[PDB]
Amino acid sequence: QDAPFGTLLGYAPGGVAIYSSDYSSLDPQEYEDDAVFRSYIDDEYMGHKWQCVEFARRFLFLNYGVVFTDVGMAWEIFSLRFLREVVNDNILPLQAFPNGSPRAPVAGALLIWDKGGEFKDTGHVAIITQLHGNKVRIAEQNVIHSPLPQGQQWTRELEMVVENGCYTLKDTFDDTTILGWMIQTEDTEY
């Protein structure tokens, strides 16, 4: 059963908390405007409590010391080309790999959905946490709002088809569109 807004549901790898995002009983006006809904970790802005972008930015901050910049819609992350190291403001390259790419997803990668279906007009972002032969595990906010089983540090598992040198992820929802994954690397592909 779904938990009240802000409830701790579990942790992603590295001890990164996953919180419930059900804001159905909150005033939309208030939810959008009030500063109590802004998540920070030591003066660093992580995002809007407790949306998908906030979790992805906080996961990268806590486990890699980097963040991506302030997008209005999650699907816009797929068009970013850098990450910022918070300790010194240095810029690191970030590349996009469309679903079905011969460049395999990797743990830590951002996984982005375009707008559509379950993800309406915002799209979605999750973090890939584990790679297996026929699936990946991911962690995210704004999808699962019920506590995770003890010891489970992922929210969903997605089927991964590996054929003819390409990797294709299939969503657990039927009406969505996965754009692809992002990896911290320079563009070294034609």
Decide if 52 is catalytic: yes
Q: Is 38 annotated as a binding residue?
A: no
What does the alpha-carbon distance between residue 164 and residue 159 come to, in Å, rounded to a whole number?
A: 16
Cβ 83 vs Cβ 148: under 8 Å: no
Q: Which of 185, 170, 156 is nearest to 100 (CA)?
A: 170
Whole-number Cα distances in Å, 63 to 9, 25, 50, 86, 120: 19, 32, 18, 12, 29
Query: In the beta sheet, which residues pair with residue 159?
Result: 135, 170
For the record, the structure tokens of 162 come out as 């590996």
- Provide the terminal-to-terminal Cα distance of the chain, rounded to the nearest Å: 48
What does the alpha-carbon distance between residue 129 and residue 11 come to, in Å, rounded to a whole number?
A: 12
Angstrom resolution of this structure? 1.5
Q: In angstroms, how far is CA 1 from the centroid of its own chain?
A: 22
For the record, the structure tokens of 112 come out as 């982005």
Sort residue 76 into left (φ over 0), alpha (ψ -120 to 50) or beta: alpha
Q: Is 136 annotated as a binding residue?
A: no
Q: Is 139 annotated as a binding residue?
A: no
Q: Residue 102 sits in which domain range?
A: 1-190
Q: Is the peptide bond before 50 cis (omega within 30 degrees of 0)?
A: yes
> Which alpha helices (H) appear in the chain, and where do they start and end?
28-33, 52-64
What does the alpha-carbon distance between residue 136 and residue 176 come to, in Å, rounded to a whole number?
A: 17
Sort residue 164 into left (φ over 0), alpha (ψ -120 to 50) or beta: left
Q: Is 57 annotated as a binding residue?
A: yes
Which amino acid makes up residue 25?
A: S
CATH number of the domain bearing residue 162 = 3.90.1720.10
Q: Is 142 annotated as a binding residue?
A: yes
Experimental technique for the deposited model: X-ray
DSSP summary character for residue 147: P
Query: In the beta sheet, which residues pair with residue 181?
Result: 97, 111
Those residues whose C-beta lies under 8 Å from the C-beta of residue 111, and which sit 6 or more positions away, are 105, 125, 126, 127, 128, 138, 169, 178, 180, 181
Catalytic position from the list 12, 16, 18, 52: 52
Q: How many domains are contained in the chain? A: 1
What does the alpha-carbon distance between residue 8 and residue 6 come to, in Å, rounded to a whole number?
A: 6
What does the alpha-carbon distance between residue 92 and residue 102 come to, in Å, rounded to a whole number?
A: 23
Q: Checking DSSP bridges between strand 124-131 and strand 135-139, what pairing results, if any?
A: antiparallel
